Design a protein around this ligand. Structure first.
Ligand SMILES: O=c1[nH]cc([N+](=O)[O-])c(=O)[nH]1
Ligand SMILES: [Cl-]
Ligand SMILES: [Cl-]
Length: 224
Protein backbone atom coordinates (compact mmCIF):
# COMPACT_ATOMS: atom_id res chain seq x y z
CA UNK A 1 0.00 0.00 0.00
CA UNK A 2 1.42 3.50 -1.00
CA UNK A 3 2.20 6.26 1.55
CA UNK A 4 -0.94 8.26 0.75
CA UNK A 5 -3.01 5.30 2.06
CA UNK A 6 -1.03 4.99 5.33
CA UNK A 7 -0.39 8.55 6.47
CA UNK A 8 -1.82 12.04 6.32
CA UNK A 9 -1.47 13.93 2.97
CA UNK A 10 1.23 16.33 4.10
CA UNK A 11 3.28 13.52 5.67
CA UNK A 12 2.92 11.42 2.51
CA UNK A 13 4.51 14.20 0.53
CA UNK A 14 7.18 14.87 3.17
CA UNK A 15 8.06 11.21 3.29
CA UNK A 16 8.21 10.62 -0.46
CA UNK A 17 12.03 10.45 -0.44
CA UNK A 18 11.77 7.37 1.82
CA UNK A 19 8.68 5.77 0.23
CA UNK A 20 10.69 2.72 -0.87
CA UNK A 21 12.22 2.48 2.60
CA UNK A 22 8.79 2.47 4.20
CA UNK A 23 7.70 -0.33 1.81
CA UNK A 24 10.84 -2.21 2.82
CA UNK A 25 9.89 -1.88 6.50
CA UNK A 26 6.55 -3.46 5.72
CA UNK A 27 8.48 -6.36 4.16
CA UNK A 28 10.69 -6.59 7.23
CA UNK A 29 7.69 -6.74 9.53
CA UNK A 30 6.03 -9.46 7.44
CA UNK A 31 9.27 -11.42 7.57
CA UNK A 32 9.38 -11.07 11.33
CA UNK A 33 5.87 -12.57 11.64
CA UNK A 34 6.89 -15.36 9.16
CA UNK A 35 10.04 -16.06 11.23
CA UNK A 36 7.89 -16.45 14.40
CA UNK A 37 8.86 -13.18 16.02
CA UNK A 38 6.34 -10.56 17.14
CA UNK A 39 6.53 -6.79 16.97
CA UNK A 40 5.01 -3.82 18.72
CA UNK A 41 3.08 -1.62 18.30
CA UNK A 42 0.30 -3.14 16.34
CA UNK A 43 0.69 -2.79 12.58
CA UNK A 44 -2.10 -0.31 12.34
CA UNK A 45 -0.34 1.95 14.90
CA UNK A 46 3.22 1.82 13.58
CA UNK A 47 2.87 5.01 11.49
CA UNK A 48 0.38 6.66 13.81
CA UNK A 49 2.49 9.79 14.47
CA UNK A 50 2.23 10.51 10.74
CA UNK A 51 -1.64 10.43 10.81
CA UNK A 52 -1.87 13.86 12.37
CA UNK A 53 -1.35 16.75 9.92
CA UNK A 54 2.32 17.54 8.96
CA UNK A 55 1.54 21.18 8.33
CA UNK A 56 -0.15 21.54 11.95
CA UNK A 57 3.01 20.27 13.89
CA UNK A 58 4.46 22.88 16.30
CA UNK A 59 6.36 20.73 18.82
CA UNK A 60 8.48 17.61 18.27
CA UNK A 61 9.02 15.29 21.25
CA UNK A 62 11.55 12.66 20.20
CA UNK A 63 11.64 9.13 21.56
CA UNK A 64 14.06 6.38 20.81
CA UNK A 65 12.22 3.06 20.56
CA UNK A 66 8.69 1.96 21.43
CA UNK A 67 7.92 0.54 24.82
CA UNK A 68 9.00 -3.13 24.75
CA UNK A 69 6.40 -4.25 27.36
CA UNK A 70 3.51 -6.02 25.74
CA UNK A 71 0.42 -3.88 25.46
CA UNK A 72 2.10 -0.52 26.04
CA UNK A 73 3.26 0.88 22.70
CA UNK A 74 0.56 2.64 20.67
CA UNK A 75 2.51 4.40 17.95
CA UNK A 76 2.98 7.72 19.68
CA UNK A 77 6.13 8.12 21.73
CA UNK A 78 5.56 7.76 25.50
CA UNK A 79 1.79 7.31 25.23
CA UNK A 80 -0.20 4.29 26.44
CA UNK A 81 -3.77 3.17 25.92
CA UNK A 82 -6.37 4.56 28.31
CA UNK A 83 -6.72 1.33 30.25
CA UNK A 84 -3.01 0.78 30.84
CA UNK A 85 -1.96 0.94 34.44
CA UNK A 86 0.24 1.60 36.20
CA UNK A 87 1.87 4.13 33.90
CA UNK A 88 5.35 3.31 32.64
CA UNK A 89 7.70 5.07 35.03
CA UNK A 90 9.08 7.44 32.34
CA UNK A 91 5.52 8.54 31.59
CA UNK A 92 4.72 8.91 35.26
CA UNK A 93 7.76 11.18 35.52
CA UNK A 94 6.67 13.15 32.48
CA UNK A 95 3.31 13.60 34.20
CA UNK A 96 4.94 14.69 37.46
CA UNK A 97 6.73 17.43 35.50
CA UNK A 98 3.52 18.32 33.66
CA UNK A 99 1.78 18.96 36.97
CA UNK A 100 4.68 20.87 38.50
CA UNK A 101 5.31 22.99 35.41
CA UNK A 102 1.78 23.73 34.34
CA UNK A 103 -0.19 23.39 37.61
CA UNK A 104 -2.70 20.95 36.10
CA UNK A 105 -3.93 17.91 37.99
CA UNK A 106 -2.46 14.50 37.27
CA UNK A 107 -3.92 13.19 34.04
CA UNK A 108 -6.65 10.55 34.33
CA UNK A 109 -4.74 8.10 32.11
CA UNK A 110 -1.68 7.75 29.92
CA UNK A 111 -3.22 8.54 26.58
CA UNK A 112 -1.42 11.39 24.86
CA UNK A 113 -3.72 11.52 21.82
CA UNK A 114 -4.82 15.10 22.69
CA UNK A 115 -1.24 16.31 22.30
CA UNK A 116 -0.99 14.71 18.93
CA UNK A 117 -4.32 16.31 17.88
CA UNK A 118 -2.89 19.70 18.88
CA UNK A 119 0.31 19.50 16.86
CA UNK A 120 2.72 17.72 19.23
CA UNK A 121 4.60 15.12 17.18
CA UNK A 122 5.35 12.14 19.43
CA UNK A 123 7.94 10.54 17.15
CA UNK A 124 10.19 7.60 17.99
CA UNK A 125 13.37 7.27 15.95
CA UNK A 126 12.69 3.55 15.61
CA UNK A 127 9.02 2.70 15.11
CA UNK A 128 8.86 -0.97 16.06
CA UNK A 129 10.35 -3.34 18.68
CA UNK A 130 10.27 -7.05 19.45
CA UNK A 131 8.36 -7.57 22.69
CA UNK A 132 10.48 -7.86 25.89
CA UNK A 133 13.60 -7.02 23.87
CA UNK A 134 14.37 -3.33 24.31
CA UNK A 135 15.73 -1.52 21.26
CA UNK A 136 15.73 -4.76 19.23
CA UNK A 137 14.78 -3.10 15.92
CA UNK A 138 17.70 -0.67 15.87
CA UNK A 139 19.42 -0.75 12.51
CA UNK A 140 16.50 -2.38 10.66
CA UNK A 141 15.73 0.64 8.49
CA UNK A 142 13.59 3.05 10.51
CA UNK A 143 16.30 5.58 11.31
CA UNK A 144 16.41 6.82 7.70
CA UNK A 145 12.63 7.13 7.68
CA UNK A 146 12.44 9.18 10.84
CA UNK A 147 15.48 11.27 9.88
CA UNK A 148 13.60 12.17 6.63
CA UNK A 149 10.58 13.08 8.74
CA UNK A 150 12.51 15.36 11.10
CA UNK A 151 14.47 17.03 8.30
CA UNK A 152 11.20 17.69 6.40
CA UNK A 153 9.64 19.12 9.47
CA UNK A 154 12.60 21.41 10.08
CA UNK A 155 12.54 22.59 6.48
CA UNK A 156 9.02 24.00 6.75
CA UNK A 157 8.80 27.82 6.96
CA UNK A 158 6.73 27.40 10.12
CA UNK A 159 7.89 27.52 13.73
CA UNK A 160 9.00 24.34 15.52
CA UNK A 161 10.17 23.64 19.07
CA UNK A 162 11.99 20.33 19.55
CA UNK A 163 12.00 18.82 23.00
CA UNK A 164 15.07 16.60 23.30
CA UNK A 165 15.17 14.32 26.28
CA UNK A 166 18.39 12.40 26.83
CA UNK A 167 21.72 12.05 25.07
CA UNK A 168 20.53 10.27 21.88
CA UNK A 169 17.85 12.93 21.26
CA UNK A 170 20.40 15.74 21.67
CA UNK A 171 22.33 14.40 18.76
CA UNK A 172 19.53 15.64 16.46
CA UNK A 173 20.45 19.25 17.11
CA UNK A 174 22.43 19.61 13.96
CA UNK A 175 19.37 18.78 11.89
CA UNK A 176 17.24 21.44 13.55
CA UNK A 177 19.97 24.04 12.67
CA UNK A 178 17.56 26.44 10.81
CA UNK A 179 16.38 29.81 12.41
CA UNK A 180 12.71 28.60 12.46
CA UNK A 181 13.63 25.76 14.86
CA UNK A 182 14.61 25.80 18.43
CA UNK A 183 15.64 22.92 20.60
CA UNK A 184 15.27 22.52 24.29
CA UNK A 185 17.24 19.74 25.90
CA UNK A 186 17.41 17.97 29.28
CA UNK A 187 18.22 14.65 30.82
CA UNK A 188 15.65 11.98 30.18
CA UNK A 189 12.52 11.41 32.32
CA UNK A 190 13.51 7.82 33.13
CA UNK A 191 14.11 7.28 36.85
CA UNK A 192 17.82 6.75 36.11
CA UNK A 193 18.20 10.42 35.15
CA UNK A 194 15.08 12.33 35.98
CA UNK A 195 16.17 13.95 39.27
CA UNK A 196 19.46 14.98 37.63
CA UNK A 197 17.93 17.49 35.28
CA UNK A 198 14.46 16.52 34.04
CA UNK A 199 12.30 17.41 37.04
CA UNK A 200 12.07 21.21 37.24
CA UNK A 201 13.12 21.72 33.63
CA UNK A 202 9.70 23.21 32.73
CA UNK A 203 9.71 21.96 29.10
CA UNK A 204 5.98 22.52 28.48
CA UNK A 205 5.83 26.18 29.55
CA UNK A 206 9.19 26.91 27.98
CA UNK A 207 8.13 25.38 24.68
CA UNK A 208 5.11 27.68 24.80
CA UNK A 209 7.33 30.69 25.66
CA UNK A 210 9.38 29.90 22.57
CA UNK A 211 6.44 29.36 20.26
CA UNK A 212 4.78 32.66 21.34
CA UNK A 213 8.11 34.39 20.83
CA UNK A 214 8.24 33.00 17.26
CA UNK A 215 4.70 34.21 16.50
CA UNK A 216 3.00 30.87 16.92
CA UNK A 217 0.13 29.89 19.09
CA UNK A 218 1.08 27.95 22.30
CA UNK A 219 0.14 24.30 22.79
CA UNK A 220 -2.78 23.62 25.07
CA UNK A 221 -1.10 20.82 27.05
CA UNK A 222 -4.11 20.04 29.25
CA UNK A 223 -4.98 16.36 29.41
CA UNK A 224 -8.27 14.88 30.77
O1 LIG B 1 7.70 5.54 22.98
C1 LIG B 1 8.61 5.68 23.86
N1 LIG B 1 8.29 5.51 25.10
C2 LIG B 1 9.23 5.69 26.00
C3 LIG B 1 10.55 5.98 25.68
N2 LIG B 1 11.47 6.15 26.72
O2 LIG B 1 11.03 6.18 28.05
O3 LIG B 1 12.72 6.24 26.42
C4 LIG B 1 10.81 6.20 24.33
O4 LIG B 1 11.92 6.52 23.87
N3 LIG B 1 9.82 6.08 23.45
CL1 LIG C 1 8.94 -12.44 19.68
CL1 LIG D 1 -1.10 24.53 28.56
Amino acid sequence: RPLSELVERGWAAALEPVADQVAHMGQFLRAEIAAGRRYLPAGSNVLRAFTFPFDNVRVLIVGQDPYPTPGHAVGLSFSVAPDVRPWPRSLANIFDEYTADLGYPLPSNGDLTPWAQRGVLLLNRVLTVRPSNPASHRGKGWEAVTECAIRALAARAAPLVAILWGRDASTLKPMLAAGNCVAIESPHPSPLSASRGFFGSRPFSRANELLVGMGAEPIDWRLP
